[PDB]
Every structure is written in structure tokens, then in C-alpha cells.
Design a protein around this ligand. Sequence first.
Ligand SMILES: CCCCCCCCCCCCCCCCCC(=O)OC[C@H](COP(=O)(O)OC[C@H](N)C(=O)O)OC(=O)CCCCCCCCCCCCCCCCC
Lengths: 77, 285, 348, 617
Amino acid sequence: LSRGPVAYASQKPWLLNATVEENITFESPFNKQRYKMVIEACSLQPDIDILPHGDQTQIGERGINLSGGQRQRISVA
Amino acid sequence: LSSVLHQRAKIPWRACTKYLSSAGILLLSLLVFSQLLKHMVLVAIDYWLAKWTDSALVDQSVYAMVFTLLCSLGIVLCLVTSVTVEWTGLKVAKRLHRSLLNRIILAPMRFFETTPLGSILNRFSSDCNTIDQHIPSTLECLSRSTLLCVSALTVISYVTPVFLVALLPLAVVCYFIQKYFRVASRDLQQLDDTTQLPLVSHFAETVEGLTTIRAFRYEARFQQKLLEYTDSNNIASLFLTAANRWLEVCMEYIGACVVLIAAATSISNSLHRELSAGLVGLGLT
Amino acid sequence: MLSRKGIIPEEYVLTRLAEDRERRARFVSKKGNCNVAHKNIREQGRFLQDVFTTLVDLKWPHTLLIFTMSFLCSWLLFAMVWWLIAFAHGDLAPGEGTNVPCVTSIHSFSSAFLFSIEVQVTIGFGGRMVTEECPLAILILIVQNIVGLMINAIMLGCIFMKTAQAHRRAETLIFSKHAVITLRHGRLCFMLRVGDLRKSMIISATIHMQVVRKTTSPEGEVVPLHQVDIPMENGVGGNSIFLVAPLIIYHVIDSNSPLYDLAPSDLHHHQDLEIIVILEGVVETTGITTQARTSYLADEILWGQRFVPIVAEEDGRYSVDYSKFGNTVKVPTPLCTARQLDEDRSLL
Amino acid sequence: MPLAFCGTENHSAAYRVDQGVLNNGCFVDALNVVPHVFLLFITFPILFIGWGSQHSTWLHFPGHNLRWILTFILLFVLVCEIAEGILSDGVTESRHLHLYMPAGMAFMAAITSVVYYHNIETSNFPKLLIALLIYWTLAFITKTIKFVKFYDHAIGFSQLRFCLTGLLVILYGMLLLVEVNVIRVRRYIFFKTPREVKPPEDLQDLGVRFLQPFVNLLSKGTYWWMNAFIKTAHKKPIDLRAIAKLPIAMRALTNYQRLCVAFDAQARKDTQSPQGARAIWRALCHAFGRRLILSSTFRILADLLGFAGPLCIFGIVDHLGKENHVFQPKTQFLGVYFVSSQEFLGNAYVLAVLLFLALLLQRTFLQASYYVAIETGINLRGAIQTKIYNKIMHMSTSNLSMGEMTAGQICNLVAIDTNQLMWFFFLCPNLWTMPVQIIVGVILLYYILGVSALIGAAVIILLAPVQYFVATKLSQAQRTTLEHSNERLKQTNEMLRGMKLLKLYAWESIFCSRVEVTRRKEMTSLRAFAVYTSISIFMNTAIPIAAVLITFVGHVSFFKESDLSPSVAFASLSLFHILVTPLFLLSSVVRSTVKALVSVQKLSEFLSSAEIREEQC
Ligand SMILES: CCCCCCCCCCCCCCCCCC(=O)OC[C@H](COP(=O)(O)OC[C@H](N)C(=O)O)OC(=O)CCCCCCCCCCCCCCCCC
């Protein structure tokens, strides 16, 4: 069907400072069921539950602090 | 819009009164008297110039000593006003930082458990630096400008009372222009700052994540996002500049009308009622 | 000088960020105003006929100002020209000259102004009059009579058209701001309320109901503002109605009606369902046909509510409480869809 | 005594028709009244329909600048003619209405003409513009007639009215040409086919509110459209919905395209261009010289007219300070008095009115120059940011090429360097003007005050560099304060982030004492900063007073050449005030130029780094 789109996630994770849903979706059409399955698989429940707003917190640097493993999981998601 | 209507206020009592009370008792009188004395001495220097040139066209003969005395007194008064303004600003910053620090000492735990640390860091860095460096100069220049404005309306009224009569319409128009301009300006300024911060944050994050961005081959999407942000900043700055220019233009016309009125009344008085020429020249200047 | 806006950043002072209806528009308003952007339309050149039409359509005080200015400008213009011509022929010069003037007793400009008044208003005092031996005077007199007569004719025409039209400038047909969906005679049905306020009988009162939604066709077609007409569930199926006392225009919902898939969950504000109700008719007093548009969005519909009866049987006649007009009280109305309700009724 | 139109002398024999009418000055003057009366009568109904009615409608005729500049010159010279006439009738007791009222109604007609054109431009109805075309030529004919008669009776350029009439003749011609140019382009009258007119596609959409680039030239001067916006600000607070997308001419993409064109041109013809700093300067100049030149021309004219203020005050005061103070126009021709211009300028009221007009024009020009320079700077900021980002995308993340310039450094570059560049373009008009303003100021001061003003203005001339040195060491003090402040902020953030931990530790006292000690260390440098900014304020606001005192004392005692006439002294004072202002910005201008050079060096260095480009299929 010059190279096609390639997914990637470096050793040191890279984060925005925006909403978590925007952070993971990364400018893609929001598929609700797929996103829920992904976050459930990504072990994101503890952080979103403990986060004050949940799935709308200001994630990333200069926002709400996270953990390296949590950030890596968010990236892989 | 009750909340919006309440939002539109100078807010002098809440903060300005606190500032001035934290200033002290000595330095408030020192600053006020120094400012007023310096500008009154300036007006007096101009008036004495007027009288000296009036008598020049043929009381005393050698005015120059009085002129030198007024000049020296004015120089000293300006120095005193400057030093007082700087001293007041420094002392306010000193006697505010320590108070805020001791207040944050006694905060409860729930306060930290609810309020984001972004707010405390903001109010502890940005506001502190502003009142360290930007509040004294702004206050000083505002005082200088408003007092010179008062002097340059009073003097021209003294030259021709008809100007004083005609001042009320023009001063009313000035009041309305000022009020509306402030109402728009506060908003535009805040908007400018808000629109500014995302842009630089975007730049930082795009620098820290280049590999991923190239990986998705989604470079065009971020190009569009940057274009959108840059436009959103440029147009806010453009409107800020345009509102500033509108203020400047309208006040410029008002000043020009003041010039016309003062000149016409002054010449009319100096043709028939024989007003002293020097006073005319001082008023027009 | 001033702070010069402080052009000395010298540091990017990092500051952590701190916390500190309009989606869908309406092309028909509850009052009836219509707003639709007619963007990118080839524009026909506005002839002077547009200017004349705007003249006819202005208000009363503004018409008075227009015509006073028109008359005064005509009088002053021709007074100017009369003064000019009398001046060019030596009439305005010192007296006792043998030359007979173009116009008798023209001394000043004010004299010519009064003479112009006399000529155009057809007053003609006659202390000042036109003579022979000045053909330009006769030419301009002819021109001025023709112009003044055309101006009087146009003034009369404007006044006539105003007297004719303005009698029919009152629109006092009132709907409700809320409509309902309630069970009547077993079947679910939409209801709305309409009344007439200026006590003028409305001949041939026609009512049209229209559902506008972006309904993409099953085959695939996409339609932005598809409009479907809705019957009125009259006694004969026609759209003629008679309005004296406020009515309830109950469009019964059947399998054909597009309201066959409506649910209270679908009644949420942000839905693409919009009802247009249009009351066409001619007012007996004037005879000029009029419309009465009204629109209803999902948030303006109130499920399962009946209306307060209004017609009170007073001792002599019937009273109509317009104050209790748009008040709705709840009732036991199910939230099932029309199809499920029909199947349930059939199975029972 | 009745008020006449022409002389009441000789039993009002001025109305004769001896030797043809056109040989009578009174009659030809009245003839000019007619076209203006005709316009005022015929248009005023058609206009009055305009203010009564039951957004995207925008267009501009091919001549739209020329007409407003010409009509402004026309109304200005009309006011001048009014002054000339009003002075010309002082001798006789009669009103002598003919000397000015023609020109007065001409001025009123010109105002109505511009209003009528505007109200026929908004609603695009070109045919209705015919009602103005004839007006020009008819108002031309009589006026031209008026001119030639003066030439017959030997009036000549010696008399002011001859010059004014012969000048607004040229004006009427130069705008009759404009009207026929409109006819030639759009072809609305007596042509079978008119060319289509399409509103600018940026405004074709109804969303845009910042329509400032495309409004009538007067509105762009006085920002009248802003009122509409400004009122909205009071009723409802401002949100990003209110400010729509900017016009297509101002999108950052468009500025990037222009900058790319400049770079391509400077890299094609100049083969040996490694795209260094000088190349960047060349590209920026080639991209924005037209707008910088527009701004600079406006600023220079504004400065020149600002000078006229003090000189006008001098004229008023000197003509007013005469012990005889009696004047009268002397020459005349055929029973009517003519005022020579070399005596016309003396008239005090005339001078005051002319001063007011010059001040209007100066202030409008100065504000417009500010706006154009700022807008050009803003577009350049957009272009520079887009270019920097576009170089970021192609940047390479090698360890040497990515570690030496971390994210913080490059983001600081974006913030500081681009803002400094924008400020340099803000001030670039001033670096071509402040020299001219200062030079003309010192020259004029010398001309007004003899050999004393040069000796006395060197005080401000030398006190400006003192302000520069003070600002430099002030910036150094600010940098030291910033270093201490960053240390204090780091310490405070560390103490505050672990707040609950500190509270449990009960160790808040020591860490806050350490923060206090650091604060005192910073407070010493802040003391220095405040002291030096106080010295800045004192110098800037008291050097003028000392300079004035020195000038006057030296003139009276040292030179003792003559008396200090009030006109001279007040011209000196006002000129000193007007001249001192740029002398206080010159230091900031020079510093901004230096910082802009440094910033462009940084930007070129960052633009000449590693780049990895994939193969293109
Ligand atoms: C000596 C006689 C004294 C009395 C008479 C004064 C005569 C004044 C006429 C001008 C003086 C001569 C200098 C020439 C400059 C004239 C202005 C001029 O040409 O600028 C025009 C510029 C350029 O347009 P643009 O929007 O950038 O678009 C370009 C367009 N597409 C193009 O084709 O190029 O766009 C602009 O112009 C940019 C905006 C600047 C606004 C300029 C305002 C000044 C005009 C006059 C204002 C009068 C004062 C206000 C009166 C109000 C009364 C209450």
C-alpha cells in the first residue's frame, strides 16, 4: 500500500503536559472501547484512581507528577 | 452577568491599601510630599520664566539668581522623590516576603492536600519578582504622569478660565475612553500571557520528544498545531497593540483639542483684556 | 518617558500553570426570526429602484425628516439659481436702470428664496412675477415646475403607500416556548399550543409541522438539513384550522411519522432534532397574507406533560386565561418507543 | 445694516455687469458656490436613506488611497482659503461675504463628498457614484474659471488666494482623474459589460473580526472600527471566540512563505552563500523592507510636523508681544483686499489653527507608524518561530548535536532571541529617526536662541550616554539578582514540594532560616538594582531641568547678546521637551540593536547544525 507510520517508545519515556486521554490518544479518532481495553491492559487504573481528576488530569512534566514505571506504561499504551 | 460585573473593578481597596499600609508612616509622607513639591517647583520654574520674560520686554532686574535657586531646588526634589520611591519599593518587598514566609510556615495539612502546588509556586515566584522589580517603577511613573497632568491642567486653567469651563466635556470624554480602554486592556493582557505560555511549553516538549514524533511520521499534524498556536498568539498581540493605538489616538485628539481651546481663549484674552504674553506662552507650552 | 512595556525579558521565568446551545445554532428563532448565512452569492446590482423601495419602507418620523429635507433642498437650490440668474442680468444691481429685470422685485437672495417658494408651492404672491425679455427665466421656470410637480407626486405616492401598507404591520400570533409528548387516545402524540392575541379572525388558517434532521439515507446519501412534513391529525386529514381560542395541535405519532424512534433519552439538548411549526393565513381586517414561524429544539420539548385547560365557562361568555397559557403539569407517560409500545399493545 | 454678499461701498455698485459678467470678480466667486450647493441638495436625500434601514458586504474601488489623501489635502487648503478670506475682509465695515463663504461651502461639500463615496462604497452600487463624477468637473470648471480671471487682472503668485486656488485646481484635476480611473476599471457607466468584483477571500467568510488591514484609509488612521469591538468588551468578557482567525495576509504560514522566497532568492543568485548571519539579514531585509520603509517615512514626517508645534508657539507669542500690536492688510486690487502670504503667516489665530491641524496630523502619523512597525515585527516573529520549528523537525539527535544544546537552551532561544528580534523591528524606525529628530532639534534650537542653545543642549546630548551606561550596569545588577533569585526559587521549591514531610520532621525552622539567609544575599543585589534604577529615574527626569537652567543662565550672563524674549524662551522650552523624549530611548535602541545582532548570531549558529534527511521517492 518513503516509510509508513511507525510506533515507538524510547527507553526514557516522552510525555506531553495535557490531559491523559489526549496524552495517550495522540491526535487519533477516539475509539472508546479500544481505549478502555488499552488502559485496562496498561495497568493505568491505580494512577487514574489515585489521580485527583482521574482520566482528565494534567499528566506529564510541569503537570501532575507520576512514576517512571507508570510513565513507561502510559507510553506503551 | 453579576459575576462578570463584579469582575470589572479597579480593586484599589483590597490590595493598594494593604500595600500602602505596609509601606509605613514616614515614607508615605516623604513620597507624597517629595512628589508634590518637585512638581510644584517645576510649575513655579515655568511661571517664573514667564514673569522674567514678561519684564524682559520692558520690579527687579536680575532674575537669574531666583531662576538658579528654583532649578537647584527642583533638582534636589527630583532626587529625593526618586530615592524615596526606590526605598519604599524595597522596604515593601522586604516586609512582605518575610510575612508571607511566616504565614506559609503555619499552613494546615489540608491546605496542601487540596491546593495544587502550582498556585503556591506561582504566587511565590511571579508575584514576588513583579513587586520586587516592576511595582515600584510603575507606581513612580504613574504618580509622575498623573501629577504632571494635574499641573498642566491647573496651569492652563489659571491662564484662561474659559479653558476650565470647556474642560468638563473633554475630561468626561477622557474618562469614558480611559474606563473602556482599561476594561478591554486587562482582558487582552491576561489573554496574551495565557496564549504565550502554551507555545513555549509546546516547543520544549517537541524538543524533548523528537524521535517519537518522527517515528509516527505525524510531523505534519504538529506543524499544523504549531501554526495554530502561533496564530493564536500573534492575533492576541495584534489586538493588544491595536487597542493601545486606539487609546493613543483618541487621547491624542483630546490633547489636540485642548491645545486649540487653550490657544484660542488665550489669544482672545491677550488681544483685548491684555493678558501678559509670557503667561500665554507658558500655558501653550 | 515610560516603562516602554518593559522590553527586557532577560529570562524565561518558568511559571507552573494554575487552575482558573453554542455548539448547535438555530435557523428559526422562537420569536420567528430567520438567520442563515447566505455566503458566497453573486450579487445583483442595486438599481435606484432599491433606493426608492427603501424610501417607501422607512418609518414615520424618518419619512417626515426625508421629505422636509427634500422640499427644503429643492426650494433652496432653485432659489440659488434664481438669485444667480437675476444677478447675471443686472436685476440685483442698483435701481433706476432702464433695463427691465428678468424678475420684478428681486432685491436680495431672500427675495429670490421667497419667489422660489411662491413658484414651487404654487402660492404665487405676485408682488414678484416673471416677465418676458428673459427666456432663460422661462426655461428655468418650466424646469422648476416640472421638478416640483414630480416631487409632489412622489411625496403623495410615498404617503399613499405608507397608509396602505402600515395597517398590516402587526404580528401578534403567539406560540408556547414549550411543547410536549403525551399519550392521547392510547397512542403517543406530540402537542404544541398556538393562539391569537390581536382579536382578529384569521381566514384559511393553515398549519405545517416539519421535522428537520441530518438524516443520512440507508442507501448512503448524506443530507444536511432534511425536512419532512408531519400530518396534523385533524378530523379530516386536511391542514385547515380555525383559531379563536388557543388550541392543541396534536400530531398523532404513527409508524409513518419520523417521531417513531423518539425516546426521552433522545430528548437530550444536544440532539439533531428540530421542529418547525408554520402558521400561514390571511388577516381578515387587512387582507395581506402573513406567516408565523416558530422552532422547537429538543431541550424546549418537555416529555409526558399535559397542559392546563384555559377556557373557563363564565356566567355570560367564555373566559380565556392567557396568564396560565404556557404552564405544563406532569402525568404518567411511559418512556418506551412507539414501536415497542405498539408491539406491547398488540401482544396484550 | 444688512449683511451683503459683496461690497456695500459705492452704494453697492459691486454687482454691476460692466464689460461682461465674467470680468466681475464677485460673480465668478458666486459661481463656485453653485456646484457645492447642487451636491449638498441632490445627495443629501440619497444619503439620508443611508442612516435609515429596515456584514460581508465589503469592497474597495480601484482608487481608494489616492482619493482620501487628495480629499484631505483639499479640505486642508480649503480651511487655509477660509483663513485667507477671513483676514482679507478686515478693512471695510461690510461683511464682504464673498471672500470666504464659497470656500466654506466647498469644504462642507468635500466632507459630504467623502461621506457619500463611503456610503456608496459600502453597499456596492457603482452607478450612484455618477452623481459625484460630474460634481468634480463642474466644481472644476468654475474654479478653473475663477483661476484664469485672477491671471487676467494681474493677481499673480504674490497673493495667497491665487496660490490656494491654483493648488486646489490641481487637486480637483488629480481626483477627476481618479473618478475616470474608477470608470475605466470597473466600467459601470455606459458600458455593456462591467468587470466582476469579488470581495477579498479572507473576508469572504463572515467569521473574521480583525478587519483592520482592509478599511478606509481614514479608519485605519483612527482605528474607528475598534469602537465596535471595544463596546463588546464591556457587555461580555473577552474569550478567544471574540478574536477570530486573522486575515490570510497575516497567517504565520504566509510569512514563512515570504521568508522562504527571500532565502531561495538569496541562495540562488548568490551561489557562494553558506546561509550565514549576513545572509539572514539580507533575507529579512528583502522580505520586509517595503513595510519598514513605510513606517520610517511616517515617523520622519511625524517628527517634522511635531517640530512645527514649538515653532508655531514661537510665532504666536512673538506676534503677540508687540508694543504697537496693530496690523492691517495693505495691498488690494479692484475694490477688494488681497492678503499677501508673507503677512498671512503672521495672523495669530491663523497660526493657532494651523498648529492644531499640524498636531492632528502629527499625532495620527506617529500612532500609525507605531502600529505599522509593531505589526511588521509581529509578522516577523511568526515567521521566525515557524522557521525555527521547521529547522527543529530536521534536526539530528546525535549526542554532540543534542547534548550541547539541551531543550532548555533552545526553548530559551525561542523565547528570548525571537522577542529581541521583534523588539529590534519595533524600534528600527527609531534608529533612522532619533538621529534626524535630534539633529533637526539642535539646529532649530540654535536658530531660535543664537549661540547659547548649542552650548546648552550638549548637556542633554552628553547626559543620554550617561543614561546608557547606567542602564548597562543596571542590567548587570539585574543579572546578579536573577542568579540569586534562581537559587532562592530552587531552595523554596525543594522545601515546599515535600511539605508534609517537613511538617512531620518539625524541621521547617532551619530550612526557612536558610531560605531567609539566601534571601538576604539576594536582597543586597536587589538594593544595588533599586539604587541604580532610582539614579536612572533621577537623571532622566532632571537632566532637562538642568539643561534648561544652564541654557538660559549662559545666554543671559555669559553671552548677554540680547534680551530673552518670551517667544524665544518658550520655543526653547517646548523644543527641549519634544527633543528630550527620543534622547531617553536612544540608549534602549542601541542596546536592542546589539542584542539583535547577538541573537541573529545565535540563530544562524543553530540554523547551521546537523540535519538528517531521508531519501525521497
Ligand atoms: C501638508 C498638508 C497637511 C494637511 C493634509 C495632510 C495630508 C495627509 C496625506 C498623507 C501625507 C503624505 C504621505 C503619504 C502616505 C499616505 C498614506 C499611504 O499611502 O499609506 C497607505 C498604506 C498602504 O496600505 P496597506 O493597508 O498597507 O495595503 C497596501 C495596499 N494593498 C497597496 O496597494 O498599497 O496604508 C496606510 O496608510 C497604513 C495606515 C496608516 C494610516 C495613515 C493615516 C494618515 C492619513 C491622514 C489622516 C488624517 C488625520 C485624521 C483626521 C480625523 C479627523 C477627526
